[PDB]
Amino acid sequence: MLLNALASLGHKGIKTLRTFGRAGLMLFNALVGKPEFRKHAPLLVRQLYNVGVLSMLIIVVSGVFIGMVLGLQGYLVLTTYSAETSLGMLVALSLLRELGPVVAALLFAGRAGSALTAEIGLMRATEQLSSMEMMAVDPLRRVISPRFWAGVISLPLLTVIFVAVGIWGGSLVGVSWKGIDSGFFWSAMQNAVDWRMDLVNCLIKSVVFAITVTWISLFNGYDAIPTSAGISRATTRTVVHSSLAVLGLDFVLTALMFG
Amino acid sequence: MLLNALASLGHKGIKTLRTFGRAGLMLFNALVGKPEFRKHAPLLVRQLYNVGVLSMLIIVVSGVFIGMVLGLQGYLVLTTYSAETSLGMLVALSLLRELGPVVAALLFAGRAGSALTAEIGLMRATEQLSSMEMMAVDPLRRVISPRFWAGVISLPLLTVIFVAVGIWGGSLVGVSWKGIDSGFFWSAMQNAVDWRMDLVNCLIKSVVFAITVTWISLFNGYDAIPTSAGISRATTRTVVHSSLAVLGLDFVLTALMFG
Amino acid sequence: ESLSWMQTGDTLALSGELDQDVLLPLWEMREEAVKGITCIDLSRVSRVDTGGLALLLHLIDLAKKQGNNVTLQGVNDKVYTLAKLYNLPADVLPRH
Amino acid sequence: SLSWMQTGDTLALSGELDQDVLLPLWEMREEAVKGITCIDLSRVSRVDTGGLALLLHLIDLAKKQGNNVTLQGVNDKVYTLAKLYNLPADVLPRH
Amino acid sequence: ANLVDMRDVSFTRGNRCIFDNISLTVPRGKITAIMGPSGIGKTTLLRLIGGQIAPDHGEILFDGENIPAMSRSRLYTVRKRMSMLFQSGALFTDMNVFDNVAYPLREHTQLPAPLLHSTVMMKLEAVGLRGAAKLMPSELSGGMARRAALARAIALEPDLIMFDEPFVGQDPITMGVLVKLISELNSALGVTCVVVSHDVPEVLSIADHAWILADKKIVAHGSAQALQANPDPRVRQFLDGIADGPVPFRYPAGDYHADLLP
Amino acid sequence: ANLVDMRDVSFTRGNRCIFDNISLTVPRGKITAIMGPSGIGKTTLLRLIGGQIAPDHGEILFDGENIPAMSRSRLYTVRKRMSMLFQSGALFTDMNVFDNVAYPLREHTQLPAPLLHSTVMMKLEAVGLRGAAKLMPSELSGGMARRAALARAIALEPDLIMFDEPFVGQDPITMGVLVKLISELNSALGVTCVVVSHDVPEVLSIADHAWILADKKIVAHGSAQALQANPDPRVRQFLDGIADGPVPFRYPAGDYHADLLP
Amino acid sequence: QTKKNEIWVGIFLLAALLAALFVCLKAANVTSYTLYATFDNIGGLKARSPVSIGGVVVGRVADITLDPKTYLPRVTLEIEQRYNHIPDTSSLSIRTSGLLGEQYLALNVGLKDGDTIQDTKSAMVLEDLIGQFLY
Amino acid sequence: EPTYTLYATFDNIGGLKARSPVSIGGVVVGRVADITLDPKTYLPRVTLEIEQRYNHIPDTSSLSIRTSGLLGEQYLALNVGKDGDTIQDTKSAMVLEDLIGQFLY
Amino acid sequence: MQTKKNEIWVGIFLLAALLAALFVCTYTLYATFDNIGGLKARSPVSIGGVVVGRVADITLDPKTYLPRVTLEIEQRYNHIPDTSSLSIRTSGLLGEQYLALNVGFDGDTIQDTKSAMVLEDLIGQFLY
Amino acid sequence: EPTYTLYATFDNIGGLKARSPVSIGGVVVGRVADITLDPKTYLPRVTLEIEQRYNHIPDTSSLSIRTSGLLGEQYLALNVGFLKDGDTIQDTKSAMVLEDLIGQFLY
Amino acid sequence: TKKNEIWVGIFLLAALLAALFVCLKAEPTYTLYATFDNIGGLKARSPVSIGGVVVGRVADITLDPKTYLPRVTLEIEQRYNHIPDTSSLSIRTSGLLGEQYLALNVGAILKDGDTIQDTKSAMVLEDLIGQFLY
Amino acid sequence: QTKKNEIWVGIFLLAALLAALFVCLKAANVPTYTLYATFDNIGGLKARSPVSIGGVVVGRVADITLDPKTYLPRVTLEIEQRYNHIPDTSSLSIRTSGLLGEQYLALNVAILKDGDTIQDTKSAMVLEDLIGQFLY
Numbered sequence A, B: 001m002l003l004n005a006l007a008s009l010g011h012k013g014i015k016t017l018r019t020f021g022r023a024g025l026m027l028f029n030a031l032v033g034k035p036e037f038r039k040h041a042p043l044l045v046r047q048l049y050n051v052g053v054l055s056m057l058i059i060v061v062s063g064v065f066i067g068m069v070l071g072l073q074g075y076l077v078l079t080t081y082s083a084e085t086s087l088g089m090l091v092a093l094s095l096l097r098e099l100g101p102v103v104a105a106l107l108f109a110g111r112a113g114s115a116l117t118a119e120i121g122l123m124r125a126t127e128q129l130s131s132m133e134m135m136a137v138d139p140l141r142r143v144i145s146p147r148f149w150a151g152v153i154s155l156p157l158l159t160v161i162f163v164a165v166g167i168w169g170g171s172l173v174g175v176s177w178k179g180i181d182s183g184f185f186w187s188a189m190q191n192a193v194d195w196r197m198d199l200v201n202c203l204i205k206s207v208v209f210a211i212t213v214t215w216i217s218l219f220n221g222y223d224a225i226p227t228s229a230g231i232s233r234a235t236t237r238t239v240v241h242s243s244l245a246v247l248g249l250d251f252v253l254t255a256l257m258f259g
Numbered sequence C: 001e002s003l004s005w006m007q008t009g010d011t012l013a014l015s016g017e018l019d020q021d022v023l024l025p026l027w028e029m030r031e032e033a034v035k036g037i038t039c040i041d042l043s044r045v046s047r048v049d050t051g052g053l054a055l056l057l058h059l060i061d062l063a064k065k066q067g068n069n070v071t072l073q074g075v076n077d078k079v080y081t082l083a084k085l086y087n088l089p090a091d092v093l094p095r096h
Numbered sequence D: 001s002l003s004w005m006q007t008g009d010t011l012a013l014s015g016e017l018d019q020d021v022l023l024p025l026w027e028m029r030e031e032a033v034k035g036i037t038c039i040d041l042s043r044v045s046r047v048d049t050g051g052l053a054l055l056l057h058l059i060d061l062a063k064k065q066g067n068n069v070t071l072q073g074v075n076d077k078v079y080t081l082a083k084l085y086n087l088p089a090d091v092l093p094r095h
Numbered sequence E, F: 001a002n003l004v005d006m007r008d009v010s011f012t013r014g015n016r017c018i019f020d021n022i023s024l025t026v027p028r029g030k031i032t033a034i035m036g037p038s039g040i041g042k043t044t045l046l047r048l049i050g051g052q053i054a055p056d057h058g059e060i061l062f063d064g065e066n067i068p069a070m071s072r073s074r075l076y077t078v079r080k081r082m083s084m085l086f087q088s089g090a091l092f093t094d095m096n097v098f099d100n101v102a103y104p105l106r107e108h109t110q111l112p113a114p115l116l117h118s119t120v121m122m123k124l125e126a127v128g129l130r131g132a133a134k135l136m137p138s139e140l141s142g143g144m145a146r147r148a149a150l151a152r153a154i155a156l157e158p159d160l161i162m163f164d165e166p167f168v169g170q171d172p173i174t175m176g177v178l179v180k181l182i183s184e185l186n187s188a189l190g191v192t193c194v195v196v197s198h199d200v201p202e203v204l205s206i207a208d209h210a211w212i213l214a215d216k217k218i219v220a221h222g223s224a225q226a227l228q229a230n231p232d233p234r235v236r237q238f239l240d241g242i243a244d245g246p247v248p249f250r251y252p253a254g255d256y257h258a259d260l261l262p
Numbered sequence G: 001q002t003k004k005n006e007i008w009v010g011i012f013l014l015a016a017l018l019a020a021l022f023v024c025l026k027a028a029n030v031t032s033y034t035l036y037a038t039f040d041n042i043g044g045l046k047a048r049s050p051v052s053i054g055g056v057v058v059g060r061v062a063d064i065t066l067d068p069k070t071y072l073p074r075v076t077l078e079i080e081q082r083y084n085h086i087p088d089t090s091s092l093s094i095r096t097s098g099l100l101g102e103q104y105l106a107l108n109v110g111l112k113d114g115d116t117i118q119d120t121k122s123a124m125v126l127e128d129l130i131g132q133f134l135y
Numbered sequence H: 001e002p003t004y005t006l007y008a009t010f011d012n013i014g015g016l017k018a019r020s021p022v023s024i025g026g027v028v029v030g031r032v033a034d035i036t037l038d039p040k041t042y043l044p045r046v047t048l049e050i051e052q053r054y055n056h057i058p059d060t061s062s063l064s065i066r067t068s069g070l071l072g073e074q075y076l077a078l079n080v081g082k083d084g085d086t087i088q089d090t091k092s093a094m095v096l097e098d099l100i101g102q103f104l105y
Numbered sequence I: 001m002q003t004k005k006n007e008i009w010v011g012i013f014l015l016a017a018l019l020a021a022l023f024v025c026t027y028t029l030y031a032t033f034d035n036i037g038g039l040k041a042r043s044p045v046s047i048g049g050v051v052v053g054r055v056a057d058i059t060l061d062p063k064t065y066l067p068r069v070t071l072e073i074e075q076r077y078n079h080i081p082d083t084s085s086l087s088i089r090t091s092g093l094l095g096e097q098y099l100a101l102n103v104g105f106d107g108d109t110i111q112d113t114k115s116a117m118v119l120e121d122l123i124g125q126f127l128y
Numbered sequence J: 001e002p003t004y005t006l007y008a009t010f011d012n013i014g015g016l017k018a019r020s021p022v023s024i025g026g027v028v029v030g031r032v033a034d035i036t037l038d039p040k041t042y043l044p045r046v047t048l049e050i051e052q053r054y055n056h057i058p059d060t061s062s063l064s065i066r067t068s069g070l071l072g073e074q075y076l077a078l079n080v081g082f083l084k085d086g087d088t089i090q091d092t093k094s095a096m097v098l099e100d101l102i103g104q105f106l107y
Numbered sequence K: 001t002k003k004n005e006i007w008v009g010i011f012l013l014a015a016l017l018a019a020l021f022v023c024l025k026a027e028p029t030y031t032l033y034a035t036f037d038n039i040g041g042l043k044a045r046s047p048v049s050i051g052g053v054v055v056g057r058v059a060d061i062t063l064d065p066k067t068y069l070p071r072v073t074l075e076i077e078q079r080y081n082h083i084p085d086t087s088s089l090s091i092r093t094s095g096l097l098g099e100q101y102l103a104l105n106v107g108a109i110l111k112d113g114d115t116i117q118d119t120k121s122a123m124v125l126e127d128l129i130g131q132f133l134y
Numbered sequence L: 001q002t003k004k005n006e007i008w009v010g011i012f013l014l015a016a017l018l019a020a021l022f023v024c025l026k027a028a029n030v031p032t033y034t035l036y037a038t039f040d041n042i043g044g045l046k047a048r049s050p051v052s053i054g055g056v057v058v059g060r061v062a063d064i065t066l067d068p069k070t071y072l073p074r075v076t077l078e079i080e081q082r083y084n085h086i087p088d089t090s091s092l093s094i095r096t097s098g099l100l101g102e103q104y105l106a107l108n109v110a111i112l113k114d115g116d117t118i119q120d121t122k123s124a125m126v127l128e129d130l131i132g133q134f135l136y
Ligand SMILES: Nc1ncnc2c1ncn2[C@@H]1O[C@H](COP(=O)(O)OP(=O)(O)O)[C@@H](O)[C@H]1O
Pocket: E013, E018, E039, E040, E041, E042, E043, E044
């Protein structure tokens, strides 16, 4: 014990209570100024280059690798109940509700999530964060707000392309390799669920994941030790903190408007 | 185009082919020497501190989250057929086959795959690799093969603890929260394949995923430019290359010994 | 802290101070500022800066095409001290 | 190699002072010094720093009986190494 | 006629101080040379003048109001007059080299597009980088990054150019480049220059006020010629390289008798 | 009585080249000083001596057979006589500083536990780090990392102590410390030392053979005192640092009339 | 650059719009007056159940409710106003789509807003179907 | 594939849906394009798409609905006994709720 | 806007808004039987095919060994005669069983009931 | 709550598996521990588990193996008529198969 | 050392693609022919059986443009060669609800290209109801 | 620390084996003479088919033997050594588990020893001969 075994609240407990709020103080000072539509117009397109199209190589080839491995596994136990014409109940419903914005959001932290903390960390290592705040304005509303406003529109532009490559990739093994039907695949998804309670949930569960993923990648790059060892710790910690932000937050989203 | 538009084969085509040859000689010149059982015995216990137990932080908290999202989603469309007594066919069977060693290998490339790439990269910037090579000792049998033999022993041992936490996590929503069964959930997995092609397929694809993940992360740290920007690009490359090594290799395994 | 100009025939005497604050009423009016002006004199400026020395070379390309020669006298020593710092070769400054 | 010979109370070393020869003269070094009054040697070629520990390890177990050990007949190479690592004068002859 | 009047500050971060009762004055027209070994404050002194970090209790002025705690809007208008460089080079690698020099004067003053090209290309002759206006700044030499930071530092109207550690490790081909660039800007613009290079076979030939300090306390505030001859064994370690002196140089252990025996 | 001789080794890269018909010899008992600015090889020449990389055509001999074209087991027994240091500090952060200096002579030669403690501790007094033998190596000073790498550099049998760019940027309280370590090791052991420091006042006062070369071609092969006075405007630029000379100092890409008019 | 990245985000926005129309138009169906009836056994009916005349879908149902006096299951169903020439003599039947399927209203041909169709046909339960096979 | 259209009128189509495989002898020869109704008598007037390889089809052919699945899926079979013709010899589908009434009563 | 103390209280208010979304996620009678079949808890009761309530639990008689089940009927429907028979019906073909109160012309018991018929002896009685 | 064991000898147990529920009138009163065999007669000897809440069950209870659903597994029906620690139920009835019932209906 | 790291990269890439080349396997067979009148619900790659054991597979089923009769192309493996010409084919159903499979009833020798005359088609559910009730 | 890692690795290796015995002892499965038994109709038997007497499983099926002349399959079964008192009057049939389940061997019960062939067998009946004999 009691005289020296209380280091988890007096020293370690205050340390974990300081990192959760420094990310909230910086984003509160970055969303109060009025953005200029005529000045940030060649600025937001540059932030969509190292985030948008540089994370597209893990979608065009790995997008068919999610729908095809369910097409082979939609034949082992499904043939025992003679539901081969009901393949749309496992290839359309299980690719956007509990699988769409939970793998692409986790793969967002590998290419366009881990490079954002490397972006701010490399500029702080080359003395560029302190070089901007003395000339014109602090870089909280100059180089971070384009990284955040392009960060909130990143998953609703990557989830709608991810759910169609799994449907098109899943149909390359259901009606071509197996060869069980030709019109029963596209008609089984029409009698399924529609625009009432799930596709309105996909557009609201993908934007709540784009906030909490970009909240940690822009915090570990701004709040880090300016040395060669601090940039290696920020790249290793932005994945395990975002893994608890998509795999730990989907449990409270599945318990909402799902019976 | 034809005169100057052939840069994808003469310059870009030779860049991809050159990195595949350097990874082959790095594995061949590190697995031909006889390992000393009396010298590497305090060396392997140190290598399991930043690989095995350091990656166990994301398993004990997110391992219950895999079984809790499948328990709630195995209730929306199950009441139409009254198949609630077969919950072990939907929770236990759908976890050790293609959900266990794929999610756990994807998380291994973010905590252990990204740290092993940065650890070789920081030692090349401080020039710690050639200092061992200067005196007498090759670094391929000093800092490489302990980091290679620990990867093929961690991921088969990280997946057998991953399947147990999701089966127990499936019971928190299977017999505790929902309450549809008490003993029928534990007896539904009793009518499945125990050791014919289910649990042995959880071992032969996990030790293959243990090779192809630790081969790229050790090569990207060995083929990194020793600057401040070289160790950041290598940590972003080891996640996107291992993502195609887990999802891209999964397609050729569901066509083997799976009907 | 204003920039004014007075032609007075063939002088173009800049009465106001020369700085980098206001440059808009003298930028697009340079086509009607010099047509055949052969002498440039100024004695009421305070100091010159790095943004104002670009205006001294901007009045050469449209003045030599009309068929006249422009000389520059009466200026301070600050435009000659910065003449070696930017390595201005020819047709920019009289170097007097 | 390294050879050892007493010749009364001198403990003369005739073998070459190498870095791999301190292994046989490690378990028998407790019974090596027995009333040695003057360390003398003239058959060595060079002295290494890894072999310099034996000249310092022979002082503590020999001074506890109540006898001093003089060190002469050495080259000036061990005295240039004496100032190099700042060897103390209470265990060195300082000649 | 000073520029910045700094008084006793400490700036203790969590456990230890960097300064202990320091004093400094900067004259108008001279070059202030603030040297020092590794361990006492050199770079962080320049950050306390600008006021980016929050200092400790102390009275520092800039011929008027207090620097770090005056306001938020007027503080940005008074900090733009410094426009300092950095050691590694404050060049943004995500953009071109034509925009790195054209950055601090694009939105500060109102300049048209053909007028902006005529003022950004003239400053490149002053450091010798006239052809460095159409290529990527991803590759450079060992001394080209310091010249590009100087070409963008004279874009505003400055009164002190704070050189943050120039030619700390360089070839003598480019170390002899920046020893004349200090004198050409002082003899033409008439402003003050702060060099903090901790090596004096060439700094004292061009500077006029040297600042040698040790054990985080100021001890020398003389000129560049009256500090070489003084009877004290504290500042002579910095002038010529010797082995002994005020430095410990050995870091002795406990007893030096019973250790390394077992 | 030469130790290492290099006979026209080029080491041509993929698009450019580093050396063009160089000739380098090292005498026994003297200090070889390899100087030069950026543009030539400084640290890549010594990697051809150890054999870590494969060079181009040419012969380099360490008084015997060819170094980079021999067997693997023979190359590990000849390279142990060098035991060079590094610029950034070849110290392992996972272990203590007592195990950093011990790491060579633990796995090379066989010493028991009372004998090993009497050899690694006595080597730290020559560099002044005996009291600093029980602390973590995570924090050091600006010149303390080069003293710990030099104390482990002479744990084996020394023949070629290649100082990998020492005191390139440092404070003058250690400038007269590390250049003394060049003179102490060369005189007491009689072994050769190779320094590649390009700072002109410090290395030329302790060396006897200077090698000034530029535009990837060797031009000076004399001593340290016979290269100061010679009638050629090629080596006086490196000795006396000035602005102009053989360098263009403009980086030209035009004529300074086509730009800045619009 | 400031123009090369404009082309890469140009082909990226149209790729999301092409992928958006692939799931709500090709995969799923195209998305852009009431009646009264009283049954005796509805079986497993629920909300949003499709009503069928001839064998095609013409609409859904509003809700399923009851009566606190007669205790008979009254169902509220709605159809399109174009199909209003159905006669009143039409027995509402609750059939299933094949053997194992959802229970849908299978109306046959033999109206006004709020017309209570009296002739109905209740759903079949298995407790007396196998009882009539034996007895 | 070049196909030509036909028409047929039934009484109760059963569980025939869109894109239903029409066949003859168990081998599929086309798909069902659209299912229509009559505006007055409300009868299912189906259309058929037969490929160009099968042209010798007499007008005395009979169409009858057969079951191809327990989830409502059925299929048409052309039993042999141009452009814009209508087959008159048709037979309606069977209902499990209706065929049990004849066996009981 | 403080540095360390102002950022503490905003963390619980975001955590308290998350636990509030995951937190929230009649008169009985008695009717005995002889063979209830495969009924269990939470089984819906009916009045002719429409759900009006569920059951509470299943108990037995400790002296005569016959199944006696309880059931819940909502207070909106009260006029139920004593001659109302109760049979055990199935929903569809493969679905679970349920109770259906056949209406004829708190604490009350049902006399006329109908137990579930297992089809293992129906095919044997059809031949023998 | 301390469950007492019993024994029962049949001739054909059918599709019985482990942990099968026993029933007295449609309600589960226990489980089945294991299914054994006799090495001299080759008859399925299955043990039963009945809780202590009901004890006065006679030994003339007709044990008939019924099916759990309509096409799945089977279970035990303890049809009481008119037992202690370690007793055997005498009145036993075997289960049925589909291939033997169609042989009597055809011939 | 440039070409040394190039030739080794071709050998590892060719060895990796060698295990992925022959993978869609999980035979000098002779083809058969049969003409039925109503196949039923057979599909491609349906196994043919003689007495419960699998003996081969069915390649495809093409229609005749002259008589409009279904022609099935069933195949027999390397065994089961000695069979008389008096055999008969009858399509059966595997189990109670499974897929259909061709069955050869044992009754010269059928060579490569010979057809069988004795064939038995399937029985549709619409025919057995109309025959039993009427 | 070289001591704190040993007590965290050692509790991790025991977690891998308690998770291994939970899927081995609490699973489906964790000295057998063979016989010969020819047949006429197999139907749905495969490898490791359950051999049963009286409904409870007593053995497994190793492989399958075929006849090149009469085309009659021979199922190679494996009776455990605990039961060696099977008479010669007992036959062997192939029954189905329930209605839609898998197929299994059901022996309806000189002493049968190793190296014997069962001759009395009536396996099953196919559905095509069930409807064809009921109607005709
Ligand atoms: N914000 C900070 N975080 C950690 N350490 C600091 C910080 N500011 C100053 N220091 C420490 O104070 C010391 C002061 O040295 P300084 O003169 O600032 O070095 P430099 O001139 O290289 O910046 C440094 O060694 C540094 O480690």
